């Protein structure tokens, strides 16, 4: 009861006076939050992008390779025959009412 067990030391440990309460920060804490950013916290900046969007103006579009001009088939491409039409094919005239006389004679090879 003379030494030890009876040592409350009303003062010890940097100070310890029922006060302290650590007034260090109590406010200024993570104010910069890992710093590095100084940004409005993506509050609203969609205008920022990292991809092409020149769909209408793709590849310095400048009518260098037809820009929707008769490019919806271009006569297409097929090969199956069956057609024969376009240029003034037949012209008759040889018959009708005989102009320069296309009759009055017949001699079949056989």
Swiss-Prot record:
PTMs per UniProt: Phosphorylated on Tyr residues after T-cell receptor triggering by LCK in association with CD4/CD8.
Primary localisation category: membrane
Positions bearing Phosphotyrosine: 10, 18, 29, 57, 69, 88, 99
Modification Phosphoserine occurs at: 4
Residues on Cytoplasmic side: 1-110
Entry GO terms, CC: alpha-beta T cell receptor complex; cytoplasm; Fc-gamma receptor III complex; gamma-delta T cell receptor complex; Golgi apparatus; plasma membrane; T cell receptor complex
Coiled coil ranges: none
Region (Disordered): 29-57, 74-100
Protein localization: Cell membrane
Keyword annotations of the record: Adaptive immunity, Cell membrane, Host-virus interaction, Immunity, Membrane, Phosphoprotein, Receptor, Repeat, Signal, Transmembrane, Transmembrane helix
Expression across tissues: CD3Z is expressed in normal lymphoid tissue and in peripheral blood mononuclear cells (PBMCs).
Biased composition (Basic and acidic residues): 29-42
Gene Ontology molecular function: identical protein binding; protein heterodimerization activity; protein homodimerization activity; protein tyrosine kinase binding; transmembrane signaling receptor activity
Record membrane topology: Single-pass type I membrane protein
Domain ITAM: 7-35, 46-74, 77-105
GO BP term, example: Fc-gamma receptor signaling pathway
Family: Belongs to the CD3Z/FCER1G family.
Connected disease: Immunodeficiency 25: An immunological deficiency characterized by T-cells impaired immune response to alloantigens, tetanus toxoid and mitogens.
Comment block on domains: The ITAM domains mediate interaction with SHB.
Assembly and binders: The TCR-CD3 complex is composed of a CD3D/CD3E and a CD3G/CD3E heterodimers that preferentially associate with TCRalpha and TCRbeta, respectively, to form TCRalpha/CD3E/CD3G and TCRbeta/CD3G/CD3E trimers. In turn, the hexamer interacts with CD3Z homodimer to form the TCR-CD3 complex. Alternatively, TCRalpha and TCRbeta can be replaced by TCRgamma and TCRdelta. Interacts with SLA. Interacts with TRAT1. Interacts with DOCK2. Interacts with SLA2. Interacts with SHB. Interacts with ZAP70. Interacts (tyrosine phosphorylated) with SHC1 (via SH2 domain). Interacts with PTPRC. (Microbial infection) Interacts with HIV-1 Nef; this interaction up-regulates the expression of the Fas ligand (FASLG) at the cell surface.
Protein name (database record): T-cell surface glycoprotein CD3 zeta chain
Biological source species: Homo sapiens
């Amino acid at each position: 009861f003379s030494r030890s067990a009876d040592a409350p030391a009303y003062q010890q440990g940097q100070n310890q006076l029922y006060n302290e309460l650590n007034l260090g920060r109590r406010e200024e804490y993570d104010v910069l939050d890992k710093r590095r950013g100084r940004d409005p916290e993506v509050g609203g900046k969609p205008q920022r992008r990292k991809n092409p969007q020149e769909g209408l103006y793709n590849e310095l579009q400048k009518d260098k390779v037809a820009e929707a001009y008769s490019e919806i088939g271009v006569k297409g491409e097929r090969r199956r025959g069956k057609g024969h039409d376009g240029l003034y094919q037949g012209l008759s005239t040889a018959t009708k009412d005989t102009y320069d006389a296309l009759h009055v004679q017949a001699l079949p090879p056989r």
